[PDB]
């Protein structure tokens, strides 16, 4: 179950953007913490749109997935506020935001070793989920958060976490699914109920492509009809700018889901460079 947070202990501050049928805000939670100390803690507030309240079950199931498992590379959920009409998910607030924006802002500053450390961390998180037979269903650079920047001076690497998947692709309208090509794998375009552990290996490949492309979005120039035809013609993504991980990307985005490598194998490949 989810810890219930009182509407009166939450303050909503600035809008940070939107997700799928959600609005996202920075906020503050008043709480009693360890030793009975009172705290005013920064939080990330995710609000399901009133118009799409019929998705509330999938909205919360997405975060519940993340919450029943504990791992260093998985975002922390603090609880939920159903107080009122609103359906509110309360999560930890990460200092440096999402990776897709960070890659773009810091293009001329991110080198191959940084990308490899990030890829290894994401692969570790996905290996944990695979070993627990937990499907994420929406692996992408927008859903990777940057906790700590790299510090060459101290030799410290960056540190990321994987966020929750949001409303599942098994209940979303087809036009949203099509726009999410090529993160959504071909078999889930055929039938979103084909969502499986193999789904996440495909999307991991798409996310590595993002990491290697300075925050470009693959196939963004293609409209939804042309994205569908891309899958129907069995195309692959072009090798990124920095081509060091192109082979791994292509091996991961295999049109045969049963041939996509395990995350253990993926980690072995990453460690070999
Ligand atoms: C000055 C420019 N920056 C970057 C430095 C910021 O303003 C910024 C934005 C967000 C955070 N933190 C954040 N972001 C999340 O999601 C990512 C956001 C979701 C919806 C909109 C896009 C971003 C989160 N999810 C779950 N805990 C989160 N914490 C930190 C800083």
PDB file of N, CA, C and O in Angstrom, residues 97-136:
ATOM      1  N   UNK A  97      17.222  16.839 -12.413  1.00  0.00           N
ATOM      2  CA  UNK A  97      16.169  16.683 -13.377  1.00  0.00           C
ATOM      3  C   UNK A  97      16.395  15.477 -14.273  1.00  0.00           C
ATOM      4  O   UNK A  97      17.107  14.556 -13.943  1.00  0.00           O
ATOM      5  N   UNK A  98      15.752  15.511 -15.426  1.00  0.00           N
ATOM      6  CA  UNK A  98      15.753  14.368 -16.331  1.00  0.00           C
ATOM      7  C   UNK A  98      16.958  14.365 -17.262  1.00  0.00           C
ATOM      8  O   UNK A  98      17.538  15.402 -17.596  1.00  0.00           O
ATOM      9  N   UNK A  99      17.331  13.160 -17.695  1.00  0.00           N
ATOM     10  CA  UNK A  99      18.554  12.999 -18.463  1.00  0.00           C
ATOM     11  C   UNK A  99      18.449  13.554 -19.873  1.00  0.00           C
ATOM     12  O   UNK A  99      19.445  14.037 -20.416  1.00  0.00           O
ATOM     13  N   UNK A 100      17.281  13.494 -20.491  1.00  0.00           N
ATOM     14  CA  UNK A 100      17.172  13.967 -21.862  1.00  0.00           C
ATOM     15  C   UNK A 100      17.485  15.453 -21.959  1.00  0.00           C
ATOM     16  O   UNK A 100      18.181  15.894 -22.880  1.00  0.00           O
ATOM     17  N   UNK A 101      17.023  16.238 -20.987  1.00  0.00           N
ATOM     18  CA  UNK A 101      17.338  17.656 -20.972  1.00  0.00           C
ATOM     19  C   UNK A 101      18.804  17.891 -20.655  1.00  0.00           C
ATOM     20  O   UNK A 101      19.435  18.787 -21.218  1.00  0.00           O
ATOM     21  N   UNK A 102      19.343  17.122 -19.716  1.00  0.00           N
ATOM     22  CA  UNK A 102      20.725  17.290 -19.310  1.00  0.00           C
ATOM     23  C   UNK A 102      21.689  16.966 -20.450  1.00  0.00           C
ATOM     24  O   UNK A 102      22.739  17.606 -20.587  1.00  0.00           O
ATOM     25  N   UNK A 103      21.388  15.919 -21.223  1.00  0.00           N
ATOM     26  CA  UNK A 103      22.258  15.564 -22.344  1.00  0.00           C
ATOM     27  C   UNK A 103      22.309  16.689 -23.360  1.00  0.00           C
ATOM     28  O   UNK A 103      23.349  16.931 -23.991  1.00  0.00           O
ATOM     29  N   UNK A 104      21.171  17.339 -23.575  1.00  0.00           N
ATOM     30  CA  UNK A 104      21.120  18.423 -24.544  1.00  0.00           C
ATOM     31  C   UNK A 104      21.900  19.614 -24.018  1.00  0.00           C
ATOM     32  O   UNK A 104      22.795  20.132 -24.690  1.00  0.00           O
ATOM     33  N   UNK A 105      21.629  20.005 -22.775  1.00  0.00           N
ATOM     34  CA  UNK A 105      22.258  21.194 -22.217  1.00  0.00           C
ATOM     35  C   UNK A 105      23.768  21.030 -22.145  1.00  0.00           C
ATOM     36  O   UNK A 105      24.512  21.986 -22.385  1.00  0.00           O
ATOM     37  N   UNK A 106      24.252  19.823 -21.849  1.00  0.00           N
ATOM     38  CA  UNK A 106      25.672  19.610 -21.613  1.00  0.00           C
ATOM     39  C   UNK A 106      26.325  18.771 -22.708  1.00  0.00           C
ATOM     40  O   UNK A 106      27.320  18.086 -22.458  1.00  0.00           O
ATOM     41  N   UNK A 107      25.799  18.846 -23.936  1.00  0.00           N
ATOM     42  CA  UNK A 107      26.354  18.073 -25.045  1.00  0.00           C
ATOM     43  C   UNK A 107      27.873  18.197 -25.101  1.00  0.00           C
ATOM     44  O   UNK A 107      28.598  17.205 -24.989  1.00  0.00           O
ATOM     45  N   UNK A 108      28.370  19.419 -25.269  1.00  0.00           N
ATOM     46  CA  UNK A 108      29.807  19.671 -25.367  1.00  0.00           C
ATOM     47  C   UNK A 108      30.417  19.681 -23.964  1.00  0.00           C
ATOM     48  O   UNK A 108      30.897  20.701 -23.459  1.00  0.00           O
ATOM     49  N   UNK A 109      30.394  18.507 -23.334  1.00  0.00           N
ATOM     50  CA  UNK A 109      30.875  18.351 -21.965  1.00  0.00           C
ATOM     51  C   UNK A 109      30.709  16.912 -21.476  1.00  0.00           C
ATOM     52  O   UNK A 109      31.289  16.518 -20.457  1.00  0.00           O
ATOM     53  N   UNK A 110      29.911  16.125 -22.186  1.00  0.00           N
ATOM     54  CA  UNK A 110      29.677  14.726 -21.854  1.00  0.00           C
ATOM     55  C   UNK A 110      30.513  13.877 -22.799  1.00  0.00           C
ATOM     56  O   UNK A 110      30.335  13.957 -24.019  1.00  0.00           O
ATOM     57  N   UNK A 111      31.397  13.049 -22.254  1.00  0.00           N
ATOM     58  CA  UNK A 111      32.246  12.193 -23.078  1.00  0.00           C
ATOM     59  C   UNK A 111      31.810  10.736 -22.980  1.00  0.00           C
ATOM     60  O   UNK A 111      30.853  10.382 -22.286  1.00  0.00           O
ATOM     61  N   UNK A 112      32.555   9.876 -23.678  1.00  0.00           N
ATOM     62  CA  UNK A 112      32.161   8.480 -23.808  1.00  0.00           C
ATOM     63  C   UNK A 112      32.175   7.782 -22.465  1.00  0.00           C
ATOM     64  O   UNK A 112      31.341   6.906 -22.211  1.00  0.00           O
ATOM     65  N   UNK A 113      33.107   8.145 -21.574  1.00  0.00           N
ATOM     66  CA  UNK A 113      33.163   7.471 -20.279  1.00  0.00           C
ATOM     67  C   UNK A 113      31.936   7.800 -19.427  1.00  0.00           C
ATOM     68  O   UNK A 113      31.443   6.945 -18.675  1.00  0.00           O
ATOM     69  N   UNK A 114      31.453   9.038 -19.502  1.00  0.00           N
ATOM     70  CA  UNK A 114      30.229   9.411 -18.785  1.00  0.00           C
ATOM     71  C   UNK A 114      29.032   8.627 -19.318  1.00  0.00           C
ATOM     72  O   UNK A 114      28.229   8.087 -18.551  1.00  0.00           O
ATOM     73  N   UNK A 115      28.897   8.551 -20.641  1.00  0.00           N
ATOM     74  CA  UNK A 115      27.810   7.776 -21.222  1.00  0.00           C
ATOM     75  C   UNK A 115      27.882   6.318 -20.799  1.00  0.00           C
ATOM     76  O   UNK A 115      26.849   5.683 -20.553  1.00  0.00           O
ATOM     77  N   UNK A 116      29.091   5.762 -20.713  1.00  0.00           N
ATOM     78  CA  UNK A 116      29.219   4.362 -20.340  1.00  0.00           C
ATOM     79  C   UNK A 116      28.844   4.150 -18.886  1.00  0.00           C
ATOM     80  O   UNK A 116      28.184   3.164 -18.553  1.00  0.00           O
ATOM     81  N   UNK A 117      29.242   5.068 -18.001  1.00  0.00           N
ATOM     82  CA  UNK A 117      28.857   4.920 -16.608  1.00  0.00           C
ATOM     83  C   UNK A 117      27.344   4.984 -16.468  1.00  0.00           C
ATOM     84  O   UNK A 117      26.740   4.221 -15.708  1.00  0.00           O
ATOM     85  N   UNK A 118      26.708   5.882 -17.213  1.00  0.00           N
ATOM     86  CA  UNK A 118      25.259   5.998 -17.124  1.00  0.00           C
ATOM     87  C   UNK A 118      24.592   4.756 -17.681  1.00  0.00           C
ATOM     88  O   UNK A 118      23.641   4.237 -17.082  1.00  0.00           O
ATOM     89  N   UNK A 119      25.086   4.240 -18.816  1.00  0.00           N
ATOM     90  CA  UNK A 119      24.498   3.044 -19.400  1.00  0.00           C
ATOM     91  C   UNK A 119      24.597   1.864 -18.446  1.00  0.00           C
ATOM     92  O   UNK A 119      23.633   1.101 -18.288  1.00  0.00           O
ATOM     93  N   UNK A 120      25.755   1.707 -17.787  1.00  0.00           N
ATOM     94  CA  UNK A 120      25.938   0.622 -16.834  1.00  0.00           C
ATOM     95  C   UNK A 120      24.974   0.724 -15.652  1.00  0.00           C
ATOM     96  O   UNK A 120      24.454  -0.291 -15.173  1.00  0.00           O
ATOM     97  N   UNK A 121      24.762   1.942 -15.143  1.00  0.00           N
ATOM     98  CA  UNK A 121      23.812   2.127 -14.062  1.00  0.00           C
ATOM     99  C   UNK A 121      22.409   1.773 -14.517  1.00  0.00           C
ATOM    100  O   UNK A 121      21.706   1.043 -13.825  1.00  0.00           O
ATOM    101  N   UNK A 122      21.995   2.227 -15.712  1.00  0.00           N
ATOM    102  CA  UNK A 122      20.660   1.869 -16.168  1.00  0.00           C
ATOM    103  C   UNK A 122      20.558   0.369 -16.373  1.00  0.00           C
ATOM    104  O   UNK A 122      19.527  -0.241 -16.066  1.00  0.00           O
ATOM    105  N   UNK A 123      21.614  -0.245 -16.898  1.00  0.00           N
ATOM    106  CA  UNK A 123      21.567  -1.688 -17.080  1.00  0.00           C
ATOM    107  C   UNK A 123      21.474  -2.407 -15.741  1.00  0.00           C
ATOM    108  O   UNK A 123      20.760  -3.406 -15.625  1.00  0.00           O
ATOM    109  N   UNK A 124      22.142  -1.890 -14.711  1.00  0.00           N
ATOM    110  CA  UNK A 124      22.041  -2.520 -13.385  1.00  0.00           C
ATOM    111  C   UNK A 124      20.615  -2.465 -12.866  1.00  0.00           C
ATOM    112  O   UNK A 124      20.101  -3.435 -12.301  1.00  0.00           O
ATOM    113  N   UNK A 125      19.957  -1.316 -13.015  1.00  0.00           N
ATOM    114  CA  UNK A 125      18.577  -1.203 -12.594  1.00  0.00           C
ATOM    115  C   UNK A 125      17.685  -2.168 -13.349  1.00  0.00           C
ATOM    116  O   UNK A 125      16.770  -2.776 -12.778  1.00  0.00           O
ATOM    117  N   UNK A 126      17.915  -2.313 -14.648  1.00  0.00           N
ATOM    118  CA  UNK A 126      17.061  -3.186 -15.439  1.00  0.00           C
ATOM    119  C   UNK A 126      17.335  -4.652 -15.137  1.00  0.00           C
ATOM    120  O   UNK A 126      16.412  -5.473 -15.198  1.00  0.00           O
ATOM    121  N   UNK A 127      18.582  -4.985 -14.837  1.00  0.00           N
ATOM    122  CA  UNK A 127      18.910  -6.345 -14.369  1.00  0.00           C
ATOM    123  C   UNK A 127      18.177  -6.685 -13.065  1.00  0.00           C
ATOM    124  O   UNK A 127      17.573  -7.755 -12.932  1.00  0.00           O
ATOM    125  N   UNK A 128      18.173  -5.762 -12.104  1.00  0.00           N
ATOM    126  CA  UNK A 128      17.369  -5.945 -10.894  1.00  0.00           C
ATOM    127  C   UNK A 128      15.902  -6.201 -11.209  1.00  0.00           C
ATOM    128  O   UNK A 128      15.272  -7.067 -10.597  1.00  0.00           O
ATOM    129  N   UNK A 129      15.310  -5.418 -12.118  1.00  0.00           N
ATOM    130  CA  UNK A 129      13.901  -5.645 -12.438  1.00  0.00           C
ATOM    131  C   UNK A 129      13.724  -6.985 -13.138  1.00  0.00           C
ATOM    132  O   UNK A 129      12.754  -7.704 -12.869  1.00  0.00           O
ATOM    133  N   UNK A 130      14.635  -7.325 -14.054  1.00  0.00           N
ATOM    134  CA  UNK A 130      14.536  -8.594 -14.760  1.00  0.00           C
ATOM    135  C   UNK A 130      14.597  -9.762 -13.782  1.00  0.00           C
ATOM    136  O   UNK A 130      13.790 -10.690 -13.867  1.00  0.00           O
ATOM    137  N   UNK A 131      15.532  -9.714 -12.833  1.00  0.00           N
ATOM    138  CA  UNK A 131      15.644 -10.793 -11.853  1.00  0.00           C
ATOM    139  C   UNK A 131      14.395 -10.918 -10.996  1.00  0.00           C
ATOM    140  O   UNK A 131      14.093 -12.007 -10.494  1.00  0.00           O
ATOM    141  N   UNK A 132      13.676  -9.824 -10.800  1.00  0.00           N
ATOM    142  CA  UNK A 132      12.411  -9.813 -10.082  1.00  0.00           C
ATOM    143  C   UNK A 132      11.220  -9.984 -11.007  1.00  0.00           C
ATOM    144  O   UNK A 132      10.080  -9.904 -10.548  1.00  0.00           O
ATOM    145  N   UNK A 133      11.462 -10.261 -12.283  1.00  0.00           N
ATOM    146  CA  UNK A 133      10.405 -10.396 -13.281  1.00  0.00           C
ATOM    147  C   UNK A 133       9.391  -9.266 -13.194  1.00  0.00           C
ATOM    148  O   UNK A 133       8.185  -9.473 -13.275  1.00  0.00           O
ATOM    149  N   UNK A 134       9.900  -8.040 -13.078  1.00  0.00           N
ATOM    150  CA  UNK A 134       9.082  -6.842 -13.073  1.00  0.00           C
ATOM    151  C   UNK A 134       9.295  -6.070 -14.377  1.00  0.00           C
ATOM    152  O   UNK A 134      10.426  -5.718 -14.712  1.00  0.00           O
ATOM    153  N   UNK A 135       8.215  -5.846 -15.113  1.00  0.00           N
ATOM    154  CA  UNK A 135       8.256  -5.093 -16.360  1.00  0.00           C
ATOM    155  C   UNK A 135       8.087  -3.622 -16.022  1.00  0.00           C
ATOM    156  O   UNK A 135       7.182  -3.262 -15.261  1.00  0.00           O
ATOM    157  N   UNK A 136       8.964  -2.774 -16.561  1.00  0.00           N
ATOM    158  CA  UNK A 136       8.795  -1.319 -16.439  1.00  0.00           C
ATOM    159  C   UNK A 136       7.815  -0.797 -17.484  1.00  0.00           C
ATOM    160  O   UNK A 136       6.765  -0.230 -17.160  1.00  0.00           O
TER     161      UNK A 136
END
